[PDB]
Amino acid sequence: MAEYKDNLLGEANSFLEVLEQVSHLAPLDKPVLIIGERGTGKELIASRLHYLSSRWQGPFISLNCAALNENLLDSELFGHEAGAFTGAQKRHPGRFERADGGTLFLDELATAPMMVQEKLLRVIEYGELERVGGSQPLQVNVRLVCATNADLPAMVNEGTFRADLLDRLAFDVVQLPPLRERESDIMLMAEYFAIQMCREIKLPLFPGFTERARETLLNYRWPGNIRELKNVVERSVYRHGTSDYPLDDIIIDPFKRRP
Amino acid sequence: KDNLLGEANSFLEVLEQVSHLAPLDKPVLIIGERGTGKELIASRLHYLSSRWQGPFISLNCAALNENLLDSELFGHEAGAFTGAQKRHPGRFERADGGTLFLDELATAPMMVQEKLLRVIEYGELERVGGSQPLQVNVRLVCATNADLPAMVNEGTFRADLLDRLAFDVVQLPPLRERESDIMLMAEYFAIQMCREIKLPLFPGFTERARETLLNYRWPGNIRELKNVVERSVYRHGTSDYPLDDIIIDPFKRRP
Amino acid sequence: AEYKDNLLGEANSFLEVLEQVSHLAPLDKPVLIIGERGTGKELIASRLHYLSSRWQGPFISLNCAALNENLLDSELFGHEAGAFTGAQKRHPGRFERADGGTLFLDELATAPMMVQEKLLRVIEYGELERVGGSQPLQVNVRLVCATNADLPAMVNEGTFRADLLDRLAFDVVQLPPLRERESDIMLMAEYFAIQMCREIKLPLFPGFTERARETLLNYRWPGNIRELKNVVERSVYRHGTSDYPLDDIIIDPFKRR
Amino acid sequence: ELNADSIPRLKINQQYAAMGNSARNDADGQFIRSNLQEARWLIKSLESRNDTLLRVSRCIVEQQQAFFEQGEEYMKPMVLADIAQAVEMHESTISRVTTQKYLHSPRGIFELKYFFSSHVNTEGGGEASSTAIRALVKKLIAAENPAKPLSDSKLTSMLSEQGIMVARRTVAKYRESLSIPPSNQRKQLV
Amino acid sequence: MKQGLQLRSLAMTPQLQQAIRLLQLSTLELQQELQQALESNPLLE
DNA sequence: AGACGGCTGGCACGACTTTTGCAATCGCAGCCCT
DNA sequence: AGGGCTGATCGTGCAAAAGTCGTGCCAGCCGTCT
Ligand SMILES: Nc1ncnc2c1ncn2[C@@H]1O[C@H](COP(=O)(O)OP(=O)(O)O)[C@@H](O)[C@H]1O
Ligand SMILES: Nc1ncnc2c1ncn2[C@@H]1O[C@H](COP(=O)(O)OP(=O)(O)O)[C@@H](O)[C@H]1O
Ligand SMILES: Nc1ncnc2c1ncn2[C@@H]1O[C@H](COP(=O)(O)OP(=O)(O)O)[C@@H](O)[C@H]1O
Ligand SMILES: [Mg+2]
Ligand SMILES: [Mg+2]
């Protein structure tokens, strides 16, 4: 069925169309990949697809790629336990093994080791089970999700990403409307975050928006799309002031030393 | 033991090589790019091998645990500092004449290389703290994406591996080379896709873009062919969806 | 409620910073700092935790430096059972340490970028990344940081990914330099003289010469508070110093003969 | 302080201990040794029970000193896993042997499980419990018109005013637990 | 850190387990049980 | 002279507890079974 | 004359299925003022 978007911080410009395309793509479980910028709704899109985890039993599995340290990461792929490692314990299967059928959210880190990604890809392509040992991989389907945070065919040229892994990945991409692109509900989602901030503050009432402030908001380079906008929103909210003035100063650059 | 035959005379000769080799258990290589389907052909040989009822199951060379390499082909018997259990042998020990396609051989450790170089020795399976080795006949087969001589000039794999290279590695024709049943392959792939797409049939169809796809990079013979097929189909998903203006450019900026 | 301990923060900007902290105290978001060296920052962080006055312990106190192997701070999100070798049951720790609390980020800049990414991944959603096969689990706790590291500099360096850097942007604090603070410095100097006279319970606070305080000013004073505390005991080290005022402050522990 | 007089003492018969080694019969010595081993195991079991009880009791009295001093109204949310984590108490032996322990203190006589109070929500990093809620609700119903007792909604308002935020559902449920007539049923002619 | 060799106990069940189960009981429950047990032993006081 | 209204307790689900039900293979070497 | 085979000893948990509370939630009901 359909679940209410707990957040729909969406862009009427084309993230409306982007969300529509996502909805159209949603029903199948084939390869799922996205694309976006530093902090550019991409987690929010992950939530979008997780709601689009159709029907029920959407097992949300997160693959925080730059995690897993160095060593046992290999096990985190496949599965620990038996008597294998320096310990012995019950079958904690690999993270992919732990979730059967689940949604496989890729963290778009781009792992340094192509072979480690390839080993995940071989398990990702199909699961034949590990009847020999939990050290191996098993017989599991899963919904899978990818996204982009960098230049894909460049890295293909840059040799950063293996072509075979790339060929299996990105069957259907999902690019994102940047802050330099989406720019749609800037004032709209701006006051949305403002109301959220007031309610969090249990605040009396929104003082408003300054025309100078709105002009700056239009002029903002917005180095971060989604959050950094909300970040500066929080910045001004904490900056705060009398209800007499609707908005005061610019919260775009909190880093700057306080006056 | 079959699939959507690429329907190629080259494919015919490659299948001929496979069939000629079919009874033989000689170790075998292959140099196939993604979408080649050499693995599928390899396993097709495995089922069609002389050991039809044989235990034939691969294990990605990239798989092994950093230290469990001995525990990779051999399997734990006694001690090993586990202090319990560790009485299970290796899947490679679990082979005995069967098949484990040496996929991912393009990247295994030189350490892994030499340990296998021992495995290339006839028989003599040693396990941890062992008494007597096991001379366990097992069918050997592999495929790679790159050039064995290229690695050799790099010295990437030890020439011991080249010795390990035993059966004539047939190679999949390139996409530009294959160019065999592109429309027909599209037809079968799209039959399957519309089955998955659950749409009735491709009322659009058309074939001008089929020839346009004949002018395509096709990096993956089946990796991209069907991949782009589904990409375009899903972008369409409509009955009247023809071979016109359907692009393979999921990375590229569409309009 | 619970009152934070006295700190000689006589700088007017320091009072302002205290006030900013006070406003932030009801708030609950990230709290970063410029980490002035020899400057007692996490004491202010404690005053914050104290200002929150949360029931139970929300004032976690752990740095990054001892997390030499990645595994250590990795185990700030600990291990559950049998991942690697289970040396003890429920290797989890330091995470529930502020069960309903906050985190003090010390030596944060030294942390691994992979470690940093893991931390940030924890930040928003809160998922429990426990090594070993299991399910995550959130907790309503916070975090806070204080480091001499220049954040714009590291962003240029890209030492940590920018996502986390912004994710931390909720409260900054540039502590004044030790060479920046002078009047508060002598104030805390007398304060530490008295505090030592108390804790050691020596009969008499000797005092210090005007020359004594002046020369201590002529001292490098790299740490306004950390160096001062060492100097306090350094003069307290002298025997019979308490009976009569003396300018005998032991700078170099290696200084001898 | 553990009730040492209420703590039994297991004594071994030393005369039998001196009358078995001299037994030239092996069967008597073996039976005596087995009996001694069993008795030692039993005495060690009782002593371990006593010692673990003392340690956990110290931990709880530290946790429930506010419950010990101010009372059940100021009874903090106390749990075994939290107490075990706080006092390094047994992870499972404690969960077993925790049954049936009673204490006499300034508050009165309290059970072992009576020391541990449930968990209730409190904003601003504060924390809340169950026995606290029961005593507070008793006071609030006491702080009602004799003709008209406090409503379960009124009790919820009082709890939220205290910062407990019990809400009307738990308010009515605990008033049922407190076993008192609420407003529309405790109503009496003035 | 990684995995290789190294690493290395156990508890008791039944008799030790029965002794432990005796302690989860009540105080006077333990006292009457102790009386009944001491009814047998010729080497205890 | 029937609806408001809070009672007020029945009903509910998970969330914290919890109680019981669980002992071995040693180790040789002599004795028993074959 | 050779194989089986034997246990004398081998002791602070847990885990597992179950239960049970917290809190909510809901449905009728009575005092009454309409
Ligand atoms: N409507 C919204 N609801 C919730 N969070 C929002 C909303 N709009 C923006 N955000 C915030 O903006 C950010 C979205 O970018 P995110 O996906 O976190 O970055 P990245 O693309 O680097 O993964 C998050 O911090 C998110 O909380
Ligand atoms: N004859 C064939 N019929 C149908 N599909 C094929 C055929 N050959 C290859 N494929 C496809 O190729 C994919 C396997 O990729 P593969 O070519 O094995 O990569 P690599 O050759 O690099 O190992 C499978 O999904 C399979 O559907
Ligand atoms: N008000 C105070 N009372 C006691 N000790 C203090 C106080 N302020 C600072 N210190 C001491 O100064 C030392 C270092 O302080 P600080 O400069 O904040 O550390 P850092 O070098 O990490 O900034 C700490 O060990 C602390 O004990
Ligand atoms: Mg392949
Ligand atoms: Mg410091």
Numbering used by the authors:
A (entry chain 4): 1 to 259
B (entry chain 3): 5 to 259
C (entry chain 5): 2 to 258
D (entry chain M): 286 to 475
E (entry chain M): 1 to 8, 10 to 46
Excerpt from the publication:
Bacteria use sigma (σ) factors to recruit RNA polymerase (RNAP) to promoter regions of genes that need to be transcribed, with 60% bacteria containing at least one specialized σ factor, σ54, responsible for transcribing many stress response genes. The σ54-mediated transcription initiation requires specific AAA+ proteins (ATPases Associated with diverse cellular Activities) known as bacterial enhancer-binding proteins (bEBPs). DNA looping enables bEBP hexamers to engage and actively remodel the RNAP-σ54-DNA closed complex to convert it into an open complex. In this work we capture intermediate states of bEBPs in facilitating DNA opening and partial unfolding of σ54, and therefore link the ATPase activity to DNA opening and σ54 remodeling, which eventually lead to transcription activation.
To understand the structural basis and how DNA is stabilized in these complexes, we determined the structures of PspF1-275-RNAP-σ54-DNA containing mismatches between −11 and −8 [RPi(−11/−8)] and between −10 and −1 [RPi(−10/−1)]. Interestingly, DNA with a partially opened bubble between −11 and −8 did not support transcription, suggesting that this complex is unable to proceed further to an open complex. In the RPi(−11/−8), we observe multiple structural conformations, at varying degrees of tilt of PspF1-275 hexamer ring relative to RNAP-σ54 and varying degrees of RNAP clamp opening We also observe significant degrees of promoter DNA bending, demonstrating the wide degree of conformational flexibility in the complex. The DNA density downstream of −10 was generally poorly resolved, indicating that this region was highly flexible. However, one conformation has sufficiently high resolution to allow us to resolve the DNA. In these complexes, we observe a previously unreported interaction between PspF and σ54 RpoN domain. This interaction is only possible with the tilted ring conformation, suggesting this interaction contributes to the stabilization of this ring conformation in both RPi(−11/−8) and RPi(−10/−1), giving rise to the higher-resolution reconstruction of these conformations. Significantly, we observe the σ54 N terminus is further shifted along the PspF hexamer in RPi(−11/−8) and RPi(−10/−1) compared to that of RPi(−12/−11). This would thus support the mechanistic model in which we proposed that ATP hydrolysis and the conformational changes within the hexamer lead to translocation of the σ54 N terminus; and RPi(−11/−8) and RPi(−10/−1) are further along the transcription initiation pathway. Second, PspF1-275 hexamer ring tilts, as observed in RPi(−11/−8) and RPi(−10/−1) structures, altering interactions between PspF1-275 and DNA, which could contribute to or stabilize DNA melting.
